[PDB]
Design a protein around this ligand. Structure first.
Ligand SMILES: *[C@@H]1O[C@H](CO)[C@@H](O)[C@H](O)[C@H]1NC(C)=O
Ligand SMILES: *[C@@H]1O[C@H](CO)[C@@H](O)[C@H](O)[C@H]1NC(C)=O
Lengths: 23, 48, 92, 97
């Protein structure tokens, strides 16, 4: 989890259903 | 991108021109922005 | 000049809508407005006061309704998809 | 369709029955409460009379240019004049000036 690295235009990001805690 | 319209800011278009001339400018932005979304969604379907 | 609420604005013909606030952006004296990574105007200098104002877009989001199925009940819950609950009631 | 979120959902799905689920139907937006205008605090009118009522005019090969700056330009005095046999604008409309 340490290795891997606009909204106002009508872009959004929805959250995943399972959290990283659940996975 | 302006897509051949007078400006890419549609508030600027709509501030400078009266309606029958604003419409033909806005339609150039609408068609360019539709083609941009259509391209993006097609490639997201292929990545998915 | 009206801060801290959503307004239409026009500075020297630079029109828009949004919330105006005071700004930490330390413009050099010749700079007239600020622009973001998307090349969107996001701060401005007031032409009479010479104060720097941040521009924040007026709150918005998606709306979605949760249903137990019509066959079960006609009551529902609503999700305002990316807002703080403090903002919500002005949806009316 | 606009009565209530469930009615809006029925109307979104185009069915009188809605099965169990979550559906996105609309966008929330806050609405502008006021308008403001902020322009420079200056008052001297732009010198259009010195251009339009000049006695001498140049030959077209040696055309004059004048620079207009630091003034308030009322264009209505021009487009509401009866005088002009031509008043064509490009990239702007006269009424908006
Ligand atoms: C919600 O809004 C209040 C008031 O601005 C703020 O104190 C709080 O930190 C916010 N919480 C979130 C999660 O946005
Ligand atoms: C002087 O110029 C202005 C601007 O074109 C014009 O309105 C006015 O009629 C002219 N003056 C006279 C006395 O006609």
């Amino acid at each position: 989890f340490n290795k891997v690295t606009q909204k106002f235009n009508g872009l959004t990001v929805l959250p995943p259903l399972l959290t990283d805690e659940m996975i | 991108s302006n897509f051949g319209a007078i400006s890419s800011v549609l508030n600027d278009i709509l501030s400078r021109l009266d309606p029958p001339e604003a419409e033909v400018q806005i339609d150039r932005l609408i068609t360019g922005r539709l083609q941009s979304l259509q391209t993006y969604v097609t490639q997201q379907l292929i990545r998915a | 000049l009206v801060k801290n609420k959503c307004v239409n604005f026009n500075f020297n013909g630079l029109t828009g809508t949004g919330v105006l606030t005071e700004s930490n952006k330390k413009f050099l004296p010749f700079q007239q407005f600020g622009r973001d990574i998307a090349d969107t105007t996001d701060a401005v200098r007031d032409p009479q006061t010479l104060e720097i104002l941040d521009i924040t877009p007026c709150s918005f989001g998606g709306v979605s309704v949760i249903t137990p199925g019509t066959n079960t009940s006609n009551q529902v819950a609503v999700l305002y998809q990316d807002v703080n609950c403090t903002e919500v009631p002005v949806a009316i | 369709c606009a009565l209530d979120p469930l009615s809006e959902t029925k109307c979104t799905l185009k069915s009188f029955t809605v099965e169990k689920g979550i559906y996105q139907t609309s966008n929330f937006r806050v609405q502008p409460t006021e308008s403001i205008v902020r322009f420079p605090n200056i008052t001297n009118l732009c010198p259009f009379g010195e251009v339009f009522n000049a006695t001498r005019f140049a030959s077209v090969y040696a055309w004059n240019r004048k620079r207009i700056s630091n003034c308030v330009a009322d264009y209505s005095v021009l487009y509401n004049s009866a005088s002009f046999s031509t008043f064509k604008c490009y990239g702007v409309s006269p009424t908006k000036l």
